Amino acid sequence: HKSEVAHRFKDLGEENFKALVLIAFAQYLQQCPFEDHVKLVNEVTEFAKTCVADESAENCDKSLHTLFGDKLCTVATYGEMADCCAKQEPERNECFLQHKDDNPNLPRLVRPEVDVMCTAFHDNEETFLKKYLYEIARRHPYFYAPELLFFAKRYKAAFTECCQAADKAACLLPKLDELRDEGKASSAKQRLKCASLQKFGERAFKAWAVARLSQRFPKAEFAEVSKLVTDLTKVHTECCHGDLLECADDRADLAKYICENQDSISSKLKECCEKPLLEKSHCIAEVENDEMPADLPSLAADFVESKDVCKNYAEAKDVFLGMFLYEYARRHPDYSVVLLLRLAKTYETTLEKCCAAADPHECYAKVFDEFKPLVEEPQNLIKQNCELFEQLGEYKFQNALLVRYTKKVPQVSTPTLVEVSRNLGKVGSKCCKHPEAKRMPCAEDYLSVVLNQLCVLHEKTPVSDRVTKCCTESLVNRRPCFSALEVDETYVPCTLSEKERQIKKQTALVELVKHKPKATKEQLKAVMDDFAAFVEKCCKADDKETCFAEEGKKLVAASQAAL
Ligand SMILES: O=C(O)CCCCCCCCCCCNc1ccc([N+](=O)[O-])c2nonc12
Ligand SMILES: O=C(O)CCCCCCCCCCCNc1ccc([N+](=O)[O-])c2nonc12
């Protein structure tokens, strides 16, 4: 047991050890140069082999925070992450974490042309892929390191199969702009999992987990789900605390376990558990929810009618609420996790109040009646925005929400709002196409992450106490806290693209609603319609920028005159 580097090296392999170590160095020291990290990665990788050969060799006994911190401390003074070294453990590693730059300073990543890129690769495949992990982990310091190993293998395959194609650009770019989209979503989706542990606790995270895993594996018993939750919570605690080697291994041992215990988990993991290691864990995560068992008793007899309701609750409070979550969640694949958790806390309060009572049954009898307005509230919201999407179209719909929510929160920065609206646009596409039954959990997967992305950015750049209240108040009732955000008060002041030529128009309107929030949907559409007539006329004159300058600062006091 003596060595922890060795236990990892043996388990993960030479190739993965090197990689996860590079991800971890880039995640802690984001501003530090590429060539310097590789130097250190190799230094510890060579050292780890030393310990595999002899576990009782010098400094092999040391923990990975003591080891990776020291190596990282070799130049780092860095700047605020300079004093992180003085701290001298467990303060040293704890420092590195709180100091992770979510909103980086780092220069914008500019895509060099196909032939240019295919010759940095091929020639030096090695440092090429090692640059990919370096640049991603830097700009995404909560990016699921084991997931990023799978992304590097998808990036290598898009290059070790496209640079050798008749049409190189048509091969590379549709897969390289897919891989780019898929990783931005994975960083956001994991940054929320982390926030759920850091800003809400182990119990909230574990509750989300019990709900979700119960929805996915309804055939599986309660003791089984509880095993997976316990293991899953371990992987993410480590992965979120920067123990990238430990969790990567624990995610591997869990993928393995699921595959050897399918009978007691699901039927839908057949091909998943035949796939290679990195694909395996990813497969199981994106797997389709299994069928809920045929027959099954009504929750009421076990959580309302039973005399032992307050007995089993006072005895084991968390187990009984876990069983409520498990039993409700598995019967409800149609409900979102967040929703199922509201019903669990709602129930928790009815028990906390009623089991103190002289007649608990006559007190908590009508509890499933508190649940109806809770379920109905989002059910109605989806088949509303879906009707509005089918009506207005992706662009117009986004503009409806952009205006609405800029009026509600002009404090939240313009690009956070434009990006928020553009994620909800995807709810209109991707989620409304689905039938009723699949739509609601589909909806939270873009909302949860976009409200949390907005929340996370609000730490580096705080502007409102009102927003900060929702970003903390509660995990689950975050969505209604933003929906019931009435507003604030009286403290308010040519071509080249098409998809982005829309954002240019969006960011403008967002700012326009920032300035004049009293403007009516009549006024705002009248200005944006006369905006369309500005670009249309000027992109067809034979004195191009002469029209943009003179006829542009012509509607400036025709919009400001429409006040
Ligand atoms: O799923 C993985 O992360 C990779 C593990 C390997 C695959 C195992 C099977 C799938 C388990 C799915 C459950 C994921 N747990 C989660 C907990 C808490 C929050 N939260 O926001 O509070 C989540 N948001 O999205 N997911 C969350
Ligand atoms: O699990 C749950 O019940 C919770 C999610 C249920 C799924 C609901 C899907 C309906 C369509 C919603 C689309 C419009 N809504 C919103 C836009 C913008 C912001 N913003 O703050 O910028 C919002 N905050 O709240 N709602 C927001």
Q: Which CATH number applies to 199-290: 1.10.645.10, 3.10.150.10, 1.20.140.10, 1.10.246.10?
A: 1.10.246.10
Question: To one decimal place, what's the resolution in Å?
Answer: 2.4
Quote the tokens at residue 292. Answer: 């809920």
User: For the domain bounded by 489-552, which CATH number is listed?
Assistant: 1.10.246.10
Determine contact, residues 226/210, Cβ cutoff 8 Å: yes
**CA torsion angle for 556, 557, 561, 563 (degrees, to 10)?**
40
Beta strands in 319-472 (DSSP E): none
CB of residue 208 inside a 6 A radius of ligand 1: yes
Question: How many C-beta atoms surround the C-beta of residue 78 within 10 A?
Answer: 17
Q: Which residue CA neighbors atom 23 of ligand 1 most closely?
A: 193
Q: By three-state DSSP, how is residue 309 classified?
A: helix
Distance CA 299, CA 327 (A): 7
CA distances from 225 to 201, 212, 331, 342 (A): 19, 10, 14, 20
The answer to whether the annotation marks 4 as part of a ligand binding site is yes
Nearest to 276 by CA among 255, 307, 295, 301: 255
The answer to whether the annotation marks 238 as part of a ligand binding site is yes
Nearest to 177 by CA among 101, 116, 109: 109
Q: Which residue CA neighbors atom 3 of ligand 2 most closely?
A: 339
Nearest to 21 by CA among 350, 245, 267: 245
- Identical fold between 291-376 and 377-488: yes
First to last CA, the chain: 74
Contacts of 103 (CB under 8 A, 6+ apart): 457, 460, 461
Distance CA 398, CA 420 (A): 9
The answer to whether the annotation marks 515 as part of a ligand binding site is no
Spell out the domain ranges in the chain: 1-101, 102-191, 199-290, 291-376, 377-488, 489-552
**CA torsion angle for 19, 24, 25, 29 (degrees, to 10)?**
150
**Backbone phi, then psi, for 13, in 5-degree steps?**
100, 165
- Which residue type sits at 279? E
User: For the domain bounded by 1-101, which CATH number is listed?
Assistant: 1.10.246.10
**Backbone phi, then psi, for 178, in 5-degree steps?**
-85, -50
Quote the tokens at residue 536. Answer: 């249309």
Cα(561) to ligand 2 centroid in Å equals 34
The answer to whether the annotation marks 1 as part of a ligand binding site is yes
- Which residue type sits at 454? L
Beta strands in 84-163 (DSSP E): none
Cα(447) to ligand 2 centroid in Å equals 6
CB of residue 196 inside a 6 A radius of ligand 1: yes
| Three-state secondary structure of 447-502 | HHHHHHHHHHHHHHCCCCHHHHHHHHHCCCCHHHHHHCCCCCCCCCCCCCCCCHHH
Omega before residue 90 within 30° of 0, cis: yes
Distance CA 427, CA 424 (A): 5
User: For the domain bounded by 377-488, which CATH number is listed?
Assistant: 1.10.246.10
Contacts of 435 (CB under 8 A, 6+ apart): none
Q: Could you name the CATH architecture of 291-376?
A: Orthogonal Bundle (1.10)
- State which ligand 2 atom lies nearest to the alpha carbon of 482: 24
Distance CA 350, CA 308 (A): 15
* Residue whose CB lies within 8 A of the most ligand 1 atoms, among 196, 214, 239, 261, for a mutation test: 196
Determine contact, residues 256/248, Cβ cutoff 8 Å: no
The answer to whether the annotation marks 65 as part of a ligand binding site is yes
Question: How many C-beta atoms surround the C-beta of residue 347 within 10 A?
Answer: 24
Q: Which residue CA neighbors atom 19 of ligand 1 most closely?
A: 193
Q: Could you name the CATH architecture of 102-191?
A: Orthogonal Bundle (1.10)
